[model samples]
Target chain A: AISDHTSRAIDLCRNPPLWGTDQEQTLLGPFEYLESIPGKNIRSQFIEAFNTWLQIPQDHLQIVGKVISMLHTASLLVDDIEDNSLLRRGQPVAHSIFGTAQTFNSGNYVYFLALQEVQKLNSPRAISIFVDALTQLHRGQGMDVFWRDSLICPTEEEYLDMVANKTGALFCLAIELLQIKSTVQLDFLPLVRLLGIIFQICDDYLNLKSCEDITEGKFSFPIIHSIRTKPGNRQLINVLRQKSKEDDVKRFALAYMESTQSFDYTRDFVKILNGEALRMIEDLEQQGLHRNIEIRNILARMSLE
Target chain B: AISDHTSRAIDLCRNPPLWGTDQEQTLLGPFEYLESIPGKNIRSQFIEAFNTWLQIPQDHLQIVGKVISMLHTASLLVDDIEDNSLLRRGQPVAHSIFGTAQTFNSGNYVYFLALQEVQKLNSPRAISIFVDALTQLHRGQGMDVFWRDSLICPTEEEYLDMVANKTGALFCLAIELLQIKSTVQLDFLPLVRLLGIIFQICDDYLNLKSCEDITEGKFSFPIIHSIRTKPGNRQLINVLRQKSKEDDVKRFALAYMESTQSFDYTRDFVKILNGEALRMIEDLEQQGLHRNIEIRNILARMSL
Candidate 1:
């Protein structure tokens, strides 16, 4: 029933009070289409494990899981639009299927619907936590979009800050809302944030293997590092500025980064972050709370190994 | 300083932590440009009057006023994009200058900034009230955008509900936030909603006078009234569907509404709403709260 409520709330956003001119292609059509695509469900699983460890009620866990999914899915839709990506979970992006405006509205509509769901919890602290996370998420996304649109490369420090806010936020929100009643201070945030950084760096590295980051002209980690460290790489800069789709541009760009050893640099950086993240996890495990196997697996998945 | 803080928050959104490639024209350029075009500051005045009447502190009033303006201005920026409005407060719309995506992001960015300001109050009730108002505001906008994009006309009842959410919500937020400490119950919402309906109805009516409604093919009150009342009026619908730049279509549409007495009907509707609104105010005055001239003046200004 709790999961049903979440579905119903999302359905409300997908199909609002008013009728659209087209029968199947309405304002909510894009959301419906996107929602059809499935993901790893890793975040929801994380919430479930955390809730079980904390012994939170099953009903509360169900609601939190659904809300987190709605928010996470909504972020994916918006991110696809802003990034101008072609695929999601190996499916055509929602905005590509439905026009940008309708998709934008539907994505934003899901956010308010999520807020309405949060209101059902009737916990002010949870609401504040949710709002703060959302605000931070948008701020992070706003920076990324600005950087991508302007073609301005971010330094390593700035990129980490963005990831902490963008990727760490949902993880933090899930844990914070679940433990709102607990008097224990949250020492796990740094660990989760480190996990987020690792996740982002790995994601960026994997994008290079697929050439998706290069094709999109996104200033991914290695690219940014290469640009900043390799002075007078005018050809590379020009290639990026032109956003050339030619195979030659892609090849030259990749070969240049290879010569700079930026990819190896990023891999080593991820190793350091993952080590710190594991150590943080170890500290938490010493505090009489057993680490969930699912989290351990998640951390392992993020590892360069 | 409070206003400065509010402006800085918006400026932060306009100019985020990172640098933009464009020298003066950044991601938030649209918002910065739109913010330069000023409005009547009428909403802020409403907050000021309510705070004065409720004896809220000056410091609280300053923060409340700044938040209200931020939210109100943010609404205009969004509305311009959604409505495809050309001019705002006699200046070109932000999207026209900065493009749609950036404008959309900046507009939404300002909303979160407003939420941050509300958080500064540290009162949960204030946050709740503020969030509720914002949620309703977006829902209302969502509906309006849906209808306009779909070319589906709303019934009189649905239109009023939309207006109540879109227009009445901010006014209620202003008053409700000011009166958060008051023990007195808020019976003034009905009055405020009535004022919203009147304000929207009159605004729509004036758009017809200027041919703005016709040009945009907006489903204004009189147009909706004509569509429902004069079913099978294919000519009127066709004219709207064409969104004809031809003056003839505007003339015919205007004449059709006039012939159907729809214009007169809307005028009478506004008059009745204002009358009931005034009666509600009078009842409050009779209850020994003593009518503030500023509120009375606000209502009088709202009548047009």
Candidate 2:
């Protein structure tokens, strides 16, 4: 699915164990175990994305794709560290491999490095835009984490705005890197944002429903489910007014999952999201590629039936 | 005794809770903390160091001193997180106060913020030199931890080099900051380097002799107490020869300490070290006030 050179570039971009090390980090270096994951190559995602990204001109694509890969990987490293996750891509996460302290310091190091690296590409416009996107990503992450932990529930519209900035901004970034020749209609940006928000809602819904057994942590949609369905949900919600663990609050998610009515209700809303995304795809242009097909498949996967 | 402002500055620098909630941090913003310790005065270090620095006007003392305080605090925050330490300045550490994730991110955020803020002073020459120093500090820390778990006996020379980089680099940094206007006579830089080496050796000596308790993780002096006095020291050197630590590595430091002559030998070596440092200071043109005397007293406190 990807070329060797592209894979090497990805590996060099993501794992710079040798960068800050005074000498060649030993084979016994802290990152020795990241190799344990069989073929979960850092290169794979870059290759896959850039492979799709190759639809554009060859000259511009190289710098664009490499910068995209570098920036995205740095963001992923930050996210994984923030989540306090252990395993990533079947290997110990970067934070676990190096250390929270190093991971944190290294993130700062990488950001400065990323800026310097991008400057080498000699595209001032692109670099400025990329930096702006990085700032937005930080702000979005801060907002999302803040809201997720807060006791108050913002309106659906406010929530939708949050997801649009958080998820759609990155998608917009990918499209920007693609640098398509045709005029990207302004209307399409908002339309794409709406589709992204809808998709995020469904994605969040699936995570809460499917992985609650493993994570045992709070997620948004499941709690929303009970409130949407049960009459006693208000009382249940009242118990979780703060981030505390009580028997009633613990049962909050199970009540939503077991309620057959809640499932039916959510299923109908999911279809609405799918229909919205499908309609956006139709408006984009003629769609025959694998990316379009993949989107369609995902739409089907989220349905109740 | 230091001036009122200098003492006040040191208190403000050290007294901050250093860990707090987001709301607390916002309420006690940087400007607020700049006014007082545990609140806003922490900023006085920059002011004090800057003013004290002005006494040597020919040098870039002011900027360098400001850089030192920030870097020192930055190192403290980071190492505290690494050690999983909780209490700092009579309050929880940053990591303990903010969840580990935020603490980690904020630590980084502060580190960069420090660099960027310094750069914003718009002195490209200063920035360039500061960057070089910053890189050395980071590399030095990597080496400190790198050698810790190594299972071989680091030769005394090798051991001294490591300490010079780790502990002595900052002292070198401080002396350089104050002496920026003058040519660092080939004699001066090495003088700072020697003081650092002696200070570090004294630290090792104190660690072993501080208490009779065996549970403390202190190690004896690398040369006199450790290498010269202990027999089979060569065999014990094999402990650090390997690439990684063995489970019994804790026992190794303990055994070295338990060797009856270890403390006495290190104490004798320390006297030699102090003598060398004093002789070096005496060689300098008397700056009238024993600036070096302050550092000497601090070293004495670290001793029994």
Candidate 3:
């Protein structure tokens, strides 16, 4: 009888207790704070805009948008940690409240959770697109990090290449994942890629006004151009190296960039890209049934001024 | 036409240049440094020992072992950063060399890469098992991190629950992934789970000797035991809270633990576990078609 009792107890302890949902609350708290925001309207608008071409079913469209939302929010958590930013969207960053280690883990956890969600779509191509895009995204992110930390100035051509991978790859992921369910056989990569470059260059131009990008010592579009305009001017490069949070020091760098015509050049470059993107949309339209007005709306909304 | 010339260049720029090998070297450098070590012999041995039962194809077994190895090495990078440890197996931790942000990125990057590799095995269950195991692993890790950072003491049951999810989940991942390709038709979760407990309890025992875990103020089995013995005795808990590096102070706590019979209790407890695990192996053999010598050989190697 004693042997039976001991044996039964051994059997019970072997499998161990299951993970409790209460324990999960700690992990999900940081993730929930960012995702709970209603400000994801812009991204949702893009998905809906692009859907004008692919025209997937409503429930089907929702899953793609949901997966993309999860990835975007999770990546933002890691981005805050990497940039060591104090605020995101006028609120304290998740890592600041949750600590670095927990936030980092939460970010990776959500990434897998997003991956798991994509599998329900049951498209092998969906899985393929998810992995490929993440690989490309991180590859670009790592290169950008390397350039900033090593204080190496990449050429305009090199900067454009990184932007295409970082931003373009993400744009392609949404379109490609959405297109997989559609009867749309047309390639939107050309228009989507142009949109990505346009959006990022505009973002760079706006960061100049906010001045936070300068504080992060980021190699944004304008900063890269300013550094390249005159290779001999070490002043701008010096400001970037300091990662100065000082308002006066930041204004000095902004003045140098203004004199270099970096902001004007950036604005002009984005305008040219925007024009080029519109042409790609025209090309995509003429090639297909071409319901591209909504896409054009999204591009128009990506304004710098 | 000049119009065609400008448009032609636009066509070429859309896809962007592919990722280069040189660029990948910067990402893979830290990971390569750790996996290059010959020290992962024990994990490899366990995979092979368990393979004694499943006996899948050699190539098939290699894939399973390789995935687990990737996860183990990648997790160590993050573990060092979380624990704030100086060295790993006598070399400086990867984060110390590669910097925190890059090493952290590399760790997550490898996890996806491992997931991608498992998909090639062509089993949906394999993919399901991989996700479940990782989710469980992180769940346990978060709980453990909370207990340490918050200075809360978990009951022994709670600690065991955390261990099974953390360590046992990983062990189960390897075995379950392997078993998915097998015709064995047996549940190894029970035995594998027991081995996980036995292994961790012994690891906790050995940590007490090395004394570094105390430096980290980690909640190992012995420390947990010592803390639970007398609620009124605050000295040991105070040392743990301080995470003291002073040998004199650590020695003071160790002496107090000695007076409390904590070490003796830990030693006695691990014996009970080791015997229980052996009984599990015996039960496995008696059940049906059990060749567990290699497993017993493994359990033997997991000695204190």
Candidate 4:
């Protein structure tokens, strides 16, 4: 159902209700590029799992899930431009293929398209859920972009707050909306927030672990830990601030972080978060709700190792 | 009420609920700059007049009016960036003062904030109106930016259609939302669309006439007219497409347009649009509704 809605949304994007030449290239180019990429579809999977747990119908989930896909893909396009990222899902970013202006406008259009879908639901509760979640998402992104652009290394606590807002927002939205409309009275917000933190830290860790050549100036968990532990390390700051060669920057950053045991520290932190999430789920199960396998699988997938 | 809501929205923008040390500057600086500038609150006035026309309470209008102001200011910031213009409301553009990245994010934030207000209304009909209008608005802007960047000369009919979507959309929204909520029945959409077209064409005419030295690659009404009439004037295209000194580009384009009587043609076009709008209003009055003073004043304002 998610896939069908996504295809329909993609079709709408490819053939927009506009009059112009080169409409496909100018408008649909970014979305088409996205459709060609491979993804784990974790967000959709999470939606499906939650829908199953909540006993909502498949068609209901698709209506809401479509909004998620549009916003998620749109965010990726905008984030790529914001980060000046070169690759997305093992391919060149959308902005790299389509120009920045076109991509930006298209990304923005996707957002409104998502809102249009929410409106079709005619559910004011759903509209509020979507709007509030989007507001939080943007605020989180604003902080993330602000820290990187301004070259400010936020404290570990500050970093966690930013991640909770940025990464946790969409997850919270999906859960909260279903929770709002469904009869299920489960309160898993704290666990969901933990899930987002764990998810983001793992993402940061894996990106650094694999794509060691991306010149990301983000204050990732490892880098923040390293900076706090090794205060007054001007060389670390200098290397990060400079736009040196990709390999050179990666090598130096890794060397500094390795010497500081930043990776080990982050790995331990993620383990603790994962353990906490599992405990919460176990607690819910002990409350006699019967262990929901779909949710348990999502929690398992949240693990990095 | 409009001023109050604009101030509150500006205040929210000036101090966003974000976690950061310099959150205000990084987020609110562009909006603060906007608040400092002075301009006629025409859109708000339109909303106020509609609220009055519908006999709805002021408090009800505040929620929707706030949405209008946020979206309007947000678009200005983005349009300035898209056009790479130097001044807005006789001051340096927000991007010039705050830089592109910050301005872009703030502009995007303002959009969500507008949506946030719409959510508060809790009216699905109003939400649909706002979302539909915004979608059309962006699609229209996409075309506007596309044509300017691509330097394609669209026919006058195409240009008018774009204006209806771009400029006319908000006016239609203001009326539509009120009409949806109001017991009073009137189909003022055609009048509003005409209002948008005349308003835009008049804006184009005034900008070109005043800023003879400012090099905006606007495929404005006069430029389109010139391109249509003087089909093979490659020099006109060259002058427009070239990234030369402001005066040089403006001089050559204006000279060609003037020689082709494009400005004269556009002036006549504006008069016709204005007359059509007035006729629509008169017809509305003849339907037993009195001449709406607010709308009439708006039509008078659109006249140039």
Top TM-score hit? 3
Write down the TM-score of every candidate.
0.85, 0.57, 0.93, 0.87
What RMSD does model 4 have?
Answer: 9.0
**DockQ scores for all the models shown?**
0.16, 0.06, 0.43, 0.25
Taking the tens digit of each residue's C-alpha lDDT, what string does model 1 give over B1-304? Answer: 2244224423332233553355225545666776677567777766655554476667778787888877877787777766766877776777775666677777777777777787777787887787778777766777777777677777766676677768878888888877766655656665666666666778778776657667777778777888888688577777877866787777777778788887657666666667666766677777657458887787787565
CAPRI-wise, candidate 1 is incorrect
Q: List interface RMSDs for the candidates, in order.
A: 12.7, 18.7, 3.4, 13.5
Report RMSD (Å) for each prediction in the order shown.
Answer: 8.5, 13.7, 2.9, 9.0
Query: Model 3, stretches more than 4 Å misplaced?
Result: A1-16, A38-40, A288-290, B1-13, B287-290
**Evaluated with DockQ, which candidate comes out highest?**
3
What digit string (tens of lDDT, one per residue) describes model 4 on residues A1-305?
22343233224322333556565366666876896787988888777766655776666677777777788898888888887777778887777756777778888888887777776655677777788888777777887877777788897656766777788789888888667557778776776776776778788888886443235666787777788787877767677687566676677778878999878776666666666677777887776566578877877765655
Best model per lDDT = 3
Q: Which stretches of candidate 1 lie over 4 Å from their true place?
A: A1-29, A48-53, A96-98, A120-122, A181-186, A246-248, B1-30, B48-53, B183-186, B244-252, B302-304
> For model 3, how does the per-residue alpha-carbon lDDT over A217-262 read when each residue is reduced to its tens digit?
8888778778877888799888888888888998898888888887
lDDT of 3 at A11: 62
Off by over 4 Å in 2: A1-32, A35-87, A90-203, A208-214, A221-305, B1-71, B90-92, B122-304
Candidate 3, B133-209: lDDT as tens digits: 88877877777877888788887777877787788777888888877768887877887777777788888777767
- How big is the positional error of residue B247 in model 2, measured in Å on the Cα after superposition? 22
Q: Write down the lDDT that model 4 would get.
A: 0.71
